[PDB]
């Protein structure tokens, strides 16, 4: 929602 949307965090989110 917040960081998950970002690319830098998306890596961690592993969507």
From Swiss-Prot:
Function, as annotated: This toxin target two types of receptors, the nicotinic acetylcholine receptor (nAChR) and the G-protein-coupled receptor GABA(B). It specifically inhibits the alpha-9-alpha-10/CHRNA9-CHRNA10 nAChR, with preference for rat receptors. It interacts with the alpha-10(+)/alpha-9(-)interface of the receptor.
From-to range in the entire protein, with total length: 19 to 32 of 32
Residues with site note (Binds to the Pro-224 and Asp-225 of the rat nAChR CHRNA10 subunit): 8
Use of this protein: RgIA[Del13]dimer is an analog therapeutically interesting because it is the first dual inhibitor that potently and selectively inhibits alpha-9-alpha-10/CHRNA9-CHRNA10 and alpha-7/CHRNA7 subtypes, which are both involved in the etiology of several cancers.
Tissue: Expressed by the venom duct.
Highest classification ranks of the organism: Eukaryota, Metazoa, Spiralia, Lophotrochozoa, Mollusca
PTM note: The disulfide bond CysI-CysIII is important for alpha-9-alpha-10 subtype inhibition, whereas the bond CysII-CysIV contributes to GABA(B) modulation.
Positions marked as site (Key residue for potent inhibition of the rat CHRNA9-CHRNA10 nAChR): 6-8, 10
Protein name per UniProt: Alpha-conotoxin RgIA
Site (Binds to the Glu-221 of the rat nAChR CHRNA10 subunit): 12
Source organism (scientific name): Conus regius (Crown cone)
Subcellular location: Secreted
Coiled coil: none
